[PDB]
Design a protein around this ligand. Structure first.
Ligand code: NA
Lengths: 112, 102
């Protein structure tokens, strides 16, 4: 059961790719919820953060470092929010691990 | 009346404690013991620690009974609504989270 992210990864679905390496891919959200809204995904198709395991420690740290690097590259110096959704109550849309990065507006509280 | 503080988890690398102004029936906070003021100021040397914090977040979520789903949130700076200038991972569960996430 590959998710739609398999098409972003294999480039069969065009996307605005901000960053790519052997471990991960970064691309703009199809439906931005802020002036800047992008996703950091692992190439390893970890379905959800609840299903990450000890072996994924280095990859998970790499995803946060790529998120904060890309946030700087996208001019989010006045701040931003990183979001990971798990499961139904999380509103997880796609069952491939992704970090949302939202900036360029005041994010409110609570976070949904 | 702010709720009583409570540590859910502690190891050599981190502390997990309840949010005393919770925004969900389950709402806790994952912090490194290492002084990292904000995620934008993490550096390459923090890679293992940052993955450790996400694994602790997921593990604590399971211990708190968040099997139906939950949300992890990291705020950076004023536009992120970052309230304390120390790295915090917010974990929220026990209700439907909405979209957008603020
Ligand atoms: Na201690």
């Amino acid at each position: 059961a590959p998710t739609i992210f398999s098409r972003i990864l294999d480039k069969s679905l065009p996307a605005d790719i901000l960053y790519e390496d052997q471990q991960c891919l970064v691309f703009r959200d199809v439906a931005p919820q802020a002036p800047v809204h992008f996703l950091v995904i692992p190439k390893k198709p970890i379905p959800r953060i609840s299903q990450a395991e000890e072996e994924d420690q280095q990859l998970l740290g790499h995803l946060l470092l790529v998120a904060k690097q890309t946030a700087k590259a996208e001019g989010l110096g006045d701040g931003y929010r990183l979001v990971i959704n798990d499961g139904k109550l999380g509103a997880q849309s796609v069952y491939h691990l992704h970090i949302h990065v939202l900036g360029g507006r005041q994010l409110q509280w609570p976070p949904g």
